[PDB]
Ligand binder design. Structure first.
Ligand SMILES: CC(C)(COP(=O)(O)OP(=O)(O)OC[C@H]1O[C@@H](n2cnc3c(N)ncnc32)[C@H](O)[C@@H]1OP(=O)(O)O)[C@@H](O)C(=O)NCCC(=O)NCCS
Ligand SMILES: CC(C)(COP(=O)(O)OP(=O)(O)OC[C@H]1O[C@@H](n2cnc3c(N)ncnc32)[C@H](O)[C@@H]1OP(=O)(O)O)[C@@H](O)C(=O)NCCC(=O)NCCS
Ligand SMILES: CC(C)(COP(=O)(O)OP(=O)(O)OC[C@H]1O[C@@H](n2cnc3c(N)ncnc32)[C@H](O)[C@@H]1OP(=O)(O)O)[C@@H](O)C(=O)NCCC(=O)NCCS
Lengths: 335, 338, 337
């Protein structure tokens, strides 16, 4: 049939031939049947979701087969043929729970290349498929081999720098999508979706299966599964709750420095610097005269546009200011 | 008028992309107010007529310049000798005046001046700098143009290596150009070129200092110093505190901004902000005399620049308070005197 | 009378142009090394007594590897590798856990912490700061600050970069050790001397100072200051703060410190601190019984160390409250015991 995706990767394996990591230069969403046909026989692809290793020699064949069908992929395989490191071609018939490390990595590539958006792809059971790895200046290094390599570097007056020890590498070591800034790339995980015109500042962080439509200024934390709409700004040190109700931020929102949200934010919401709006926070909802409409749980204001959340600096009450009348607010609360 | 006495000059080695756009320039020994002797020796070889200039120059010219400066400035001469061997492209940037920058090379020089501490935040004209500072991939092999990156990432992978991309931004990190004396910076990813880190300052891991910002020194920085924010002598910014971006926010001498707190106003000398409190410009504050009685309720904004304030949030009634050691008459004078 | 040592380790390190030690790396540090090891090794090193950082030669390295052949295979193998080294070697033999007296020793004690051979507060780190020189931590390793500018220039001349990722007295831990069963998202944020317990994951916003850390397991996404130890199964939410240092702050077992919150007191077991709340020691808290009636207004300091407390700020009246599943009578007894 029509495949969901395919990509030709170069990766790394440990001493026991386990896959630590795979890099895909040119992943494809819904590749053309012409490409799949030409490639399927050579790789030994029958059906379903497969991570198929292949050889330098098979690389040259595949390069030739795709000459004249897709120039881009052919030139990639031609480079892949000179590779010292092992090769995998992962071909996915369906968008399903991943079954291999190679597939898990491809699906995170699809997100970070912006082929698919957060929540558009199945990442169920990915965690056991992503091995904990030492991310170093020489690449991924298995934790069982690391101490030895660290010693040998020191003997030569050198340093094996270990900049991360984790199941997810940092995105920019695999892709930097167009029209994006990321001040400290240590803080954006492979699998993050950084929309065009987004700038993630130093205090900003974006988990996998999360990100920004773009444009936007991210200076706080976007947790797994959180997606931030168009033109929204997250101030320095702000928090977006993780972990059911998914957290999102709408369009044109402003989340203040050091503040936080545990509810989904509707469009053009503002949260005061320093304010943490928890799902069960009891909020004094105010109409456009700043008169109490009623006290509600923050959870119940989820998705409503044009709210300003603030903590009253004289009586300590968390207040939600609107430009709507009481009868309007009550209507919104019940539909 | 004829050729002047310059604002700055520096000999730099930088990096260009395939279309010869400058990504980046490194100046080892930048000069504030260089002597007329240095300029007179160098100008004819560089072809510097007047004003503010980013003049590319050759290896041969580098030797010529080293010779001309021999016996005028030993340091500069020696640098030019080294520069003459370089593989990378050279630029001499001579600025007659401190004006809005007109080139990437000039932009980079002005950020160096700040980070070498030759000038302080706000003393230098940085207007319109963003469009001169191209977005670049800062990698372990240096600056790399974004259109050239994906290719280079592939080639490293094919050799079993990694092209590490530690930052994608218009500003590189300062310490890849300068580490000024008497300074600690725990995670250097968090101090931009253009930051001024004063002697005896320590920037901890959670600390951050933008361009055109920083510390007099000494001090402990563990929160975020936004662009244009200067922190006096002996002031401490607690872990994860915030200073608001952008009128001008500053911090006086001897302040303590609590962990996870924040300021949207200039804090006068010896102010204290309680851990967890965000003092917003429009925050309504209970100003209290000694004896802790209410003087009026003011906007935090009207307390800007006042010394010896303690800011706190009453833990029993939620009121943001400013405690003072002053009478109602004293406070009246401090807030309203002409 | 020569003793039975607190610690010993063979290190390879880096010196500046004035032969001052910037840094030492210990591959396999020993806690309470056997008398058999100390006896084979001491005459070659010239160890006499006490706490000693003893430099040694490549030839001495071979001798030591030969002496420990058939006593401790691992140490012998290490010494054989050290014999090939281009960098200078030191053997640090510590008779006692005492205030450190050398850069070599200060580094060993932090190694002991990070290998998890000892726990935070179990080791004497008194006066350590003067022993740990401020160093530029680069991609080529430790560099003296007086030599750095020159090396920065030379890299630029070759179109390369001398990356300078930290300028500090403490390097990052993972450049020395990655202990088993641990995840650290951004390793710039865990210092040598951190104790990161098995099953701990330190996310990107997490930070752990020296002489601090986690029993394990747990999720650390906030700041663990020096001298702060966090019990089994406790979660520190994103950007939470743990006050620095005379009450020593600690977090008990099974606690939840919310995102952007903070503690200036020790937290007893199974405590919860609402997201965004900072609880300082002088913070006045409304202590509520299992029926949510006011029992008493107390300073948070006096609730420190009690189990099963939920700290929250009342979103309607601004009062910092502490909720419990105990009666007024049980609570008053705890405040008076
Ligand atoms: C919440 C926020 C948006 C409100 O500011 P605002 O409404 O735009 O501007 P103002 O301060 O003029 O608001 C008007 C009134 O609210 C009052 N006010 C503001 N915050 C208050 C509070 N927490 N409690 C009581 N009154 C408050 C002001 O004093 C003023 O009173 P007035 O009507 O008697 O003049 C702002 O204070 C804030 O927190 N912004 C966050 C920005 C940020 O953190 N990051 C962006 C990138 S740095
Ligand atoms: C704001 C701060 C300075 C107040 O503490 P302080 O003035 O040093 O000393 P205390 O805590 O003893 O204050 C004295 C009184 O005020 C009370 N108090 C303190 N904070 C209060 C609050 N927020 N609401 C009501 N009462 C409070 C104390 O209970 C005590 O009451 P008492 O007069 O009945 O005995 C402090 O709590 C703080 O937040 N410091 C920030 C440090 C930090 O975050 N980082 C530094 C880097 S390690
Ligand atoms: C404080 C906290 C623990 C309370 O949550 P909870 O008790 O488990 O769940 P609930 O929301 O049902 O709380 C129960 C009651 O408290 C109320 N409540 C919660 N916070 C309140 C507040 N600050 N002021 C007043 N009421 C509050 C709820 O409305 C609810 O009221 P009800 O009994 O009238 O229906 C939670 O809000 C919190 O801060 N969690 C921190 C988690 C975090 O930041 N990170 C975890 C790692 S991702």
């Amino acid at each position: 049939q029509s495949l969901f995706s395919l990509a030709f990767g170069v990766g790394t394996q440990n001493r026991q031939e386990a896959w630590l990591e795979v890099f895909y230069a040119l992943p494809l969403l819904k590749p053309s049947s012409e490409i799949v046909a030409a490639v399927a026989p050579i790789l030994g692809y029958a059906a379903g979701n497969q991570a198929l290793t292949f050889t330098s020699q098979q690389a040259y064949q595949l390069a030739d087969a795709l000459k004249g069908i897709d120039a881009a992929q052919s030139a990639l395989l031609s480079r892949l043929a000179e590779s010292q490191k092992p090769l995998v071609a992962t071909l996915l018939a369906e968008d399903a729970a991943p079954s291999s490390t190679a597939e898990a990595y491809l699906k995170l590539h699809l997100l970070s290349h912006r082929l698919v958006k957060p929540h558009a792809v199945n990442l169920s059971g990915i965690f056991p498929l992503l091995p904990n790895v030492a991310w170093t200046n020489i690449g991924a290094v298995d934790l069982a081999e690391l101490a030895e390599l660290q010693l040998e570097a020191r003997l030569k007056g050198k340093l094996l720098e270990v900049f991360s020890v984790d199941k997810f590498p940092k995105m920019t070591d695999y892709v930097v999508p167009a029209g994006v800034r990321i001040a400290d790339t240590a803080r954006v995980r492979l699998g993050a979706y950084i929309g065009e015109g987004t700038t993630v500042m130093h205090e900003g962080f974006v988990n996998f299966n999360a990100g920004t439509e773009g444009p936007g200024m991210i200076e706080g934390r976007v947790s797994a599964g959180v997606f931030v709409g168009k033109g929204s700004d997250l101030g320095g040190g702000c928090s977006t709750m993780g972990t059911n109700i998914v957290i999102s931020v709408g369009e044109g929102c402003l989340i203040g420095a050091n503040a936080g949200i545990g509810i989904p934010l509707g469009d053009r919401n503002i949260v005061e610097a320093g304010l943490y709006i928890t799902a069960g926070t009891k909020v004094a909802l105010l109409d456009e005269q700043n008169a109490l409409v009623k006290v509600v749980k923050a959870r119940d204001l989820a998705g409503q546009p044009d709210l300003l959340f603030r903590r009253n600096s004289q009586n300590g009450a968390v207040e939600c200011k609107t430009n709507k009348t009481a009868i309007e607010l009550n209507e919104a609360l019940h539909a």
